[PDB]
């Protein structure tokens, strides 16, 4: 388990995040005074950067 | 200028999980039925005066042309 854990480096983290996070679909569940929480398109757009 | 919360529950779907341009031509005959049935009064009021005035003007012009044409 320790070998598997410390076999994770920065490049591995980037590759896994690009596999799971970059431009994927989020699922939001909210309750309460959420009248100021941004809508779905906001999060879906925030899942990627246009600078890079 | 404040927001008035309503206590709703809203289910929404991703824009990439549902087709986009099919709803334009889906159920077209009923759409045209609505557009014509709920608006024929308005079209009559908008166009009737115009076509009536045009017909009156053409009638008057032709009658004067014949009368004055010796
Ligand atoms: C004045 C001129 C400058 C104006 C700049 C405005 C935007 C500023 C900004 O930073 O926005 C980023 C910002 C990104 O969102 P964020 O929440 O700040 O951050 C999200 C990410 O974390 C971070 O966002 P990101 O990382 O995806 O990138 C954001 C930004 C960040 O920029 C940087 O980091 C540095 C600059 C880029 C460097 C690389 C090039 O970089 C870029 O936009 C990349 C541009 C690349 C070159 C494209 C050519 O943009 C927006 O939120 C969208 C703004 C939309 C503006 C629309 C304006 C028009 C709409 C109304 C029209 C009404 C009618 C008009 C006509 C009427 C008659 C005349
Ligand atoms: C005809 C078939 C129309 C099929 C269709 O699109 O139906 C959907 C459309 C859905 O209606 P809606 O639910 O109100 O949708 C409006 C939304 O805002 C629509 O939301 P949206 O923002 O997605 O709008 C999409 C837009 C997007 O439009 C397009 O994608 C069409 C763009 C095509 C290219 C346009 C090039 C134009 C070139 C002009 C060249 C002119 C040359 C002139 C030369 C003169 C020489 C003397 O399409 C429309 O708005 C529908 C067609 C509008 C034009 C008709 O239904 C109709 O258009 C019904 C048409 C018939 C109405 C009743 C006519 C009664 C006439 C009695 C006489
Ligand atoms: C020849 C026909 C080629 C058709 C290509 C697209 C095929 C297609 O799936 O068309 C349907 C699509 C709308 O589909 P949608 O609303 O998502 O739901 C139906 C899902 N099957 O229809 C569309 O997306 C059509 C509307 C978008 C067309 C954009 C065209 C841009 C062309 C730019 C050329 C620039 C040249 C310089
Ligand atoms: C050059 C100058 C041109 C000036 C043109 C002025 C246009 C004014 C537009 C006013 C808004 C309008 O026409 O709305 C559409 C109207 C009723 O639509 P509305 O009441 O908004 O909604 C009903 C439920 N959907 O419905 C209609 O208009 C239907 C009747 C149309 C008749 C056309 C002939």
In sequence order, the 6+-apart residues with CB closer than 8 A to the CB of A26 are A40, A43, A44, A47
Structural Rg of chain B based on CA atoms: 26
- Shortest-distance Cα residue to atom 18 of ligand 4: B39
Q: What is the distance between the terminal CA atoms of chain B, rounded to a whole angstrom?
A: 74
Beta carbons of B16 and A23 less than 8 angstroms apart: no
Does any CB of chain A come closer than 8 Å to the CB of residue B20?
no
Q: Which of A23, A24, A25, A32 to mutate to test the interface with B (most CBs of B within 10 A)?
A: A25
Between CA A35 and CA B39 the distance in angstroms is 38
With CA atoms as reference, report the closest residue to A28 among B20, B17, B6, B14: B14
Smallest Cβ–Cβ distance between A35 and the set B5, B12, B14 belongs to B5
Round to whole Å and give the CA distance between B33 and B43.
15
Looking up tokens 């991703």 gives B14
- Alpha-carbon distance of A34 to A26, in angstroms, equals 17
- Per 3-state DSSP, what percentage of chain A is helix, strand, and coil (rounded to 5)? 45, 0, 55
Check: CB of residue A48 under 8 Å from CB of residue A23.
yes
Report the gap between the CA of A14 and the closest CA in chain B (Å). Answer: 25
Token pair for residue B33?
A: 């039925």
Indicate which technique resolved this structure.
Answer: cryo-EM
Is residue B24 in contact with ligand 2, taking CB distance under 6 Å? yes
DSSP-derived 3-state class of residue B40: helix
Residues in chain A: 52
**Calpha distance B43→B51 (Å, rounded):** 12
CA distance B6 to A37: 15
Q: Would the CB of B57 count as within 6 Å of ligand 2? A: no
Token pair of B66, please? 């014949």
Q: Which two tokens stand for residue A48?
A: 């990627």
Residue among B7, B28, B39, B51 nearest A35 (CA): B7
């Amino acid at each position: 388990l320790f070998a598997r854990i410390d076999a994770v480096d920065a490049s591995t983290i980037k590759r896994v995040a690009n596999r799971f996070i970059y431009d994927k679909d989020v699922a939001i569940a909210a309750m309460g005074p959420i009248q100021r929480l941004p809508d779905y398109n906001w999060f879906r757009r925030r899942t990627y950067w246009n600078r890079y | 200028k404040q927001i008035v919360p309503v206590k709703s529950v809203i289910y929404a779907l991703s824009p990439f999980q549902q087709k986009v341009m099919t709803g334009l031509w889906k159920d077209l005959p009923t759409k045209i039925h609505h557009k014509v049935s709920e608006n024929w009064i308005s079209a009559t009021l908008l166009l009737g005066p115009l076509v009536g005035t045009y017909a009156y003007v053409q009638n008057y012009l032709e009658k004067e042309k014949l009368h004055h044409r010796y």
